Design an enzyme around this catalytic site. Sequence first.
Site, PDB file in Angstrom:
ATOM      1  N   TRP A 146     -50.774  79.866  32.205  1.00 37.87           N
ATOM      2  CA  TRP A 146     -50.385  80.877  32.813  1.00 37.87           C
ATOM      3  C   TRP A 146     -51.132  82.259  32.216  1.00 37.87           C
ATOM      4  O   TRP A 146     -51.434  83.242  32.914  1.00 37.87           O
ATOM      5  CB  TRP A 146     -48.902  81.048  33.016  1.00 37.87           C
ATOM      6  CG  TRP A 146     -48.049  81.393  31.684  1.00 37.87           C
ATOM      7  CD1 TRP A 146     -47.588  80.475  30.972  1.00 37.87           C
ATOM      8  CD2 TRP A 146     -47.838  82.622  31.201  1.00 37.87           C
ATOM      9  NE1 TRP A 146     -47.170  81.008  29.874  1.00 37.87           N
ATOM     10  CE2 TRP A 146     -47.095  82.519  30.055  1.00 37.87           C
ATOM     11  CE3 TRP A 146     -48.305  84.112  31.557  1.00 37.87           C
ATOM     12  CZ2 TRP A 146     -46.841  83.521  29.198  1.00 37.87           C
ATOM     13  CZ3 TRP A 146     -47.846  84.854  30.680  1.00 37.87           C
ATOM     14  CH2 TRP A 146     -47.025  84.707  29.779  1.00 37.87           C
TER      15      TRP A 146
ATOM     16  N   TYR B  50     -41.827  87.587  16.130  1.00 35.56           N
ATOM     17  CA  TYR B  50     -41.964  86.283  15.482  1.00 35.56           C
ATOM     18  C   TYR B  50     -40.806  85.832  15.434  1.00 35.56           C
ATOM     19  O   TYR B  50     -39.936  86.356  14.886  1.00 35.56           O
ATOM     20  CB  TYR B  50     -42.752  86.559  14.176  1.00 35.56           C
ATOM     21  CG  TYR B  50     -43.194  85.452  13.463  1.00 35.56           C
ATOM     22  CD1 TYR B  50     -44.177  84.803  14.123  1.00 35.56           C
ATOM     23  CD2 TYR B  50     -42.422  84.858  12.492  1.00 35.56           C
ATOM     24  CE1 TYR B  50     -44.705  83.564  13.328  1.00 35.56           C
ATOM     25  CE2 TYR B  50     -42.900  83.554  11.695  1.00 35.56           C
ATOM     26  CZ  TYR B  50     -44.117  83.123  12.383  1.00 35.56           C
ATOM     27  OH  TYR B  50     -44.350  81.955  11.559  1.00 35.56           O
TER      28      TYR B  50
ATOM     29  N   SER C 231     -42.428  84.032  21.986  1.00 38.50           N
ATOM     30  CA  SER C 231     -41.774  83.079  23.004  1.00 38.50           C
ATOM     31  C   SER C 231     -43.146  82.354  23.580  1.00 38.50           C
ATOM     32  O   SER C 231     -42.853  81.237  24.394  1.00 38.50           O
ATOM     33  CB  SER C 231     -41.248  83.810  24.213  1.00 38.50           C
ATOM     34  OG  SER C 231     -40.100  84.489  23.730  1.00 38.50           O
ATOM     35  N   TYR C 232     -44.327  82.562  23.229  1.00 40.15           N
ATOM     36  CA  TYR C 232     -45.484  81.773  23.589  1.00 40.15           C
ATOM     37  C   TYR C 232     -46.537  82.118  22.338  1.00 40.15           C
ATOM     38  O   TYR C 232     -46.607  83.286  21.930  1.00 40.15           O
ATOM     39  CB  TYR C 232     -46.136  82.050  24.926  1.00 40.15           C
ATOM     40  CG  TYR C 232     -46.316  83.314  25.325  1.00 40.15           C
ATOM     41  CD1 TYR C 232     -45.505  84.250  25.779  1.00 40.15           C
ATOM     42  CD2 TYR C 232     -47.560  83.627  25.158  1.00 40.15           C
ATOM     43  CE1 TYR C 232     -45.761  85.568  26.386  1.00 40.15           C
ATOM     44  CE2 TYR C 232     -48.153  84.847  25.828  1.00 40.15           C
ATOM     45  CZ  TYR C 232     -47.129  85.789  26.304  1.00 40.15           C
ATOM     46  OH  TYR C 232     -47.554  87.112  26.707  1.00 40.15           O
ATOM     47  N   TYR C 233     -47.296  81.082  22.170  1.00 39.68           N
ATOM     48  CA  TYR C 233     -48.328  81.244  21.259  1.00 39.68           C
ATOM     49  C   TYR C 233     -49.691  81.537  21.459  1.00 39.68           C
ATOM     50  O   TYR C 233     -50.687  80.957  21.420  1.00 39.68           O
ATOM     51  CB  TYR C 233     -48.341  80.003  20.321  1.00 39.68           C
ATOM     52  CG  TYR C 233     -46.947  79.784  19.774  1.00 39.68           C
ATOM     53  CD1 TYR C 233     -46.820  80.539  18.415  1.00 39.68           C
ATOM     54  CD2 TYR C 233     -45.910  79.266  20.251  1.00 39.68           C
ATOM     55  CE1 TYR C 233     -45.713  80.699  17.754  1.00 39.68           C
ATOM     56  CE2 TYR C 233     -44.603  79.180  19.420  1.00 39.68           C
ATOM     57  CZ  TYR C 233     -44.614  79.663  18.093  1.00 39.68           C
ATOM     58  OH  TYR C 233     -43.314  79.842  17.383  1.00 39.68           O
TER      59      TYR C 233
ATOM     60  N   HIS D  91     -49.653  88.615  21.838  1.00 40.48           N
ATOM     61  CA  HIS D  91     -48.947  89.576  22.807  1.00 40.48           C
ATOM     62  C   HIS D  91     -48.241  90.725  22.035  1.00 40.48           C
ATOM     63  O   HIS D  91     -47.610  90.336  21.068  1.00 40.48           O
ATOM     64  CB  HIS D  91     -48.517  89.012  23.956  1.00 40.48           C
ATOM     65  CG  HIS D  91     -47.360  88.022  23.626  1.00 40.48           C
ATOM     66  ND1 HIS D  91     -47.283  86.964  23.248  1.00 40.48           N
ATOM     67  CD2 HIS D  91     -45.884  88.356  23.622  1.00 40.48           C
ATOM     68  CE1 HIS D  91     -46.003  86.307  22.893  1.00 40.48           C
ATOM     69  NE2 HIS D  91     -45.204  87.500  23.219  1.00 40.48           N
ATOM     70  N   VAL D  92     -48.307  91.938  22.863  1.00 43.05           N
ATOM     71  CA  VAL D  92     -47.611  93.199  22.103  1.00 43.05           C
ATOM     72  C   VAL D  92     -46.678  93.703  23.106  1.00 43.05           C
ATOM     73  O   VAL D  92     -47.212  93.901  24.431  1.00 43.05           O
ATOM     74  CB  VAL D  92     -48.526  94.001  21.634  1.00 43.05           C
ATOM     75  CG1 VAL D  92     -47.890  95.214  20.964  1.00 43.05           C
ATOM     76  CG2 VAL D  92     -49.558  93.413  20.623  1.00 43.05           C
TER      77      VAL D  92
END
Lengths: 290, 292
Positions: free
Chosen positions: A131, A221, A224-226, A229-230
């Site tokens: 995604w 950290y 939620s996904y690796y 993102h900021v």
Amino acid sequence: PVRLPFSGFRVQKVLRESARDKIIFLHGKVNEGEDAVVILEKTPFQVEHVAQLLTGSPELKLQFSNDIYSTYNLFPPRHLSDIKTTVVYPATEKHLQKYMRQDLRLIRETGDDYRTITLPYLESQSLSIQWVYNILDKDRIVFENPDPSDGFVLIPDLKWNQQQLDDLYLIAICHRRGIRSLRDLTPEHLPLLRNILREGQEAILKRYQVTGDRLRVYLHYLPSYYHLHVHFTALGFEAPGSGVERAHLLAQVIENLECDPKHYQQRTLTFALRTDDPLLQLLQKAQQER
Amino acid sequence: VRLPFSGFRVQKVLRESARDKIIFLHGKVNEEDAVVILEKTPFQVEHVAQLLTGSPELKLQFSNDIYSTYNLFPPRHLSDIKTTVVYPATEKHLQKYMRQDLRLIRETGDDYRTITLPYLESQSLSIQWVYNILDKKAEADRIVFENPDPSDGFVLIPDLKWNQQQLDDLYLIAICHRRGIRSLRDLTPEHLPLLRNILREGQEAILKRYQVTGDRLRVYLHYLPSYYHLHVHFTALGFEAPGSGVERAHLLAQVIENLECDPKHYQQRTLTFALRTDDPLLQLLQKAQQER
């Protein structure tokens, strides 16, 4: 006569509750018997309702007063006291585990813990981030620096309707692949990080007229996904994962790298995990062993 | 039983929260100012079954296969709203209840030494109440743990508002015995022993008293702190405690490691925090930062 889809309701367990948020999640037994989850939430006020009530002879019981301060029990008309009622029936174990209050534990992950325990664990899961790549590869993008190494896209959070700025929330996703989290950040990434902070703020200023001193700009950290993102949130919005045990301000990440090039590989990072998260037991075992 | 005025006209919503289900209104009355505060009450476990049993008054809003949502219309005795009236209200009251309007400041070490510190030096700290606790002149019976060492010790005291039946809301404060440590900015390796004792002995004390392990605690300092005598907050990890956001809270464990890694960290690094727009420090910092 509108009815609940079951007979009776006996509370088995309070799954979760918040005096702050005026919400309660109940595990009930029904049809005694079967499990149901009922979530009750008091409703927010609509100022017009309140304004009209206060000029209409409200039913009040005085509780306390001094010369200027008075507190009452107000027995409102029905359009102010309705309770939002969510019913899950029948409820499975999955539903009961879903609504159960989270049971979190802090872990302080050393650089070696990450390298030896966390990273292997993450690689064994290797959850898809397709995604993310779909967004990057391309209508919701508000700003893009298309540089494939130092660039990013800026997109509104799906839950922000943009009907107000109070809960402004955008996310910057980097173009560059394979930066899994803070742990992968080196001085090589400084131009990227500086780009996100600078250009993301410039974009928000130009589009929403919100200055940078009204934004909380941070990473999570564990994320939620690796894929790095900021989060860009209104400073007045107590956004998801903006607590110290999860959020790391971008400006400070940058300065950490400036001050110690190996900071994110060497330093201990503190975060919370659910008690049923397999990673938590791996880390705890590793820590017990040394 | 009537309100203590009539003709309420909303001037302004001072603050409202959909999350917290509260609204604070500034009205004009008797055409004087008044404030009216309405707050939905928390649910009480002992009444929810009666809310849902029998034949509660409902309106169906949505239903798919297993999930449905209703409006439930509680009976009168289960409908009440907490209502607070300030009348006549002054400017002070209006400012008290107005929603905060905050700005982030990134205070460099030079901003601190040139702007912030001279400001702080000009202000009395008004911490005799702190001294009274340290000296056992006030609150002594509330102290849960004490390390009486005057250099590296502290007292551990519960927050007064904490209902200790609810460990969910756990909140204790460690206040050091040593005087003159204003904030993080004063911290040097001199303070490491104190910081380490707070972390270690505070967690131990909370495990002993409450059977809450250290990994269930968020242990942190504020910057800027609410008062200028070093103290540490020990909160339940599930409690979104006062100032636990990243723009104010610094985990004690990380403070210690920061100091271990770079002794001058807290004099050299930029610290990021929020101030109200009317804070005199924001006036000083913003004007100065812009000149620089």
